[PDB]
């Protein structure tokens, strides 16, 4: 039997005790933002951190659960808001649940058949990501966007699909939050 445990989550910083921390800078997201020059330019300026993750994951096993907070920093590549790489689940059939804790943003989701959805998130918002949907989180404000994600331990990852095909929409700013088609 594995040992149960309790770890503290800091509502102000999003940091979880004993969690495994990972960092993703702009340089780690080549080809993700539509404006390549804005990207190359910002990177040369010492690619700032786009987001950090504090995760507690179990072995890949059916019925078990993983959890992690993400600190999505505010910013834009051109006029495209800072975002996570996003992905599909290796075992696409797994769902996910997000709980927004600080700041504001939204989640962009997509199905293999072409459907795309954008769900706005503010502190207290719980987003249910159904099985089969690819998803990415977006920070649409000027402050850090912090959220806790809970997902099946055997969900796995699938960035390739998005790495190539990607999402059918991009979220940018036109004096206001705008969701438009992607190329």
Residue 23 contact, options Fe ion, its own copies, none, Cβ 5-8 Å cut-off depending on partner type: none
Place of tokens 């796995």: 156
Kindly state the helix (H) or strand (E) to which residue 42 belongs, with its residue range: helix 36-44
Q: Please give the structure tokens belonging to residue 9.
A: 């989550």
- Rounded Cα–Cα distance for residues 38 and 16 (Å): 33
Residues that bind Fe ion in the complex, under the rule CB under 5 A: 151
Q: Establish whether 87 is an annotated binding residue.
A: yes
Q: Which long-range contacts (CB under 8 A, 24 or more apart) does 110-116 make?
A: 110/134, 110/135, 110/167, 110/168, 110/169, 114/168, 116/167, 116/168, 116/169
The one segment of 23-31, 75-83, 107-115, 159-167 that binds its own copies by CB under 8 A:
107-115
Nearest approach in angstroms of CB 130 to its own copies is 4
Residue 6 contact, options Fe ion, its own copies, none, Cβ 5-8 Å cut-off depending on partner type: its own copies
Binding of residue 132 to its own copies (CB under 8 A): yes
Query: Is 23 in contact with 35 (CB distance < 8 Å)?
Result: no
Nearest approach in angstroms of CB 43 to Fe ion is 26
Give the three-state DSSP class for 24: strand
Binding of residue 64 to its own copies (CB under 8 A): yes
Distance between the two ends of the chain, CA-based, in angstroms? Answer: 49
Comparison of 43 and 163: residue with beta carbon closer to Fe ion: 163
Q: Please give the structure tokens belonging to residue 89.
A: 């689940």
Q: Establish whether 135 is an annotated binding residue.
A: yes
The one segment of 23-31, 70-78, 119-127, 169-177 that binds its own copies by CB under 8 A:
119-127
Binding of residue 36 to its own copies (CB under 8 A): no
Kindly state the helix (H) or strand (E) to which residue 37 belongs, with its residue range: helix 36-44
Contact footprint for its own copies (CB under 8 A): 1-11, 16, 56, 58, 61-65, 67, 91, 93-97, 99, 107, 109, 111, 113, 115, 117, 119-121, 123-133, 135, 148, 150-155
């Amino acid at each position: 039997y594995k040992e149960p445990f309790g770890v503290k989550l800091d509502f102000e910083t999003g940091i979880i005790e004993n969690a495994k921390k990972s960092v993703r800078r702009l340089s780690d997201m080549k080809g993700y933002f539509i404006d390549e020059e804005a990207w190359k330019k910002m990177v040369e300026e010492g690619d700032p951190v786009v987001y950090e993750v504090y995760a507690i994951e179990q072995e890949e096993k059916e019925g078990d659960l993983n959890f992690a907070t993400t600190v999505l920093y505010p910013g834009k590549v051109g006029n495209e808001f800072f975002m996570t790489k996003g992905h599909y689940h290796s075992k696409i059939d797994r769902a996910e649940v997000y709980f927004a804790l600080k700041g504001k943003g939204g989640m962009l989701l997509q199905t293999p058949e072409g459907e795309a959805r954008f769900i706005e998130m503010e502190p207290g918002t719980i987003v249910y990501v159904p099985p089969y949907w690819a998803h990415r989180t977006i920070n649409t404000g000027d402050k850090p966007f912090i959220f806790l994600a809970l997902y099946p331990a055997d969900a796995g990852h699938d960035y390739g699909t998005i790495a190539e095909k990607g999402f059918s929409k991009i979220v940018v700013e036109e004096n206001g939050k705008v969701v438009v088609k992607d190329n």
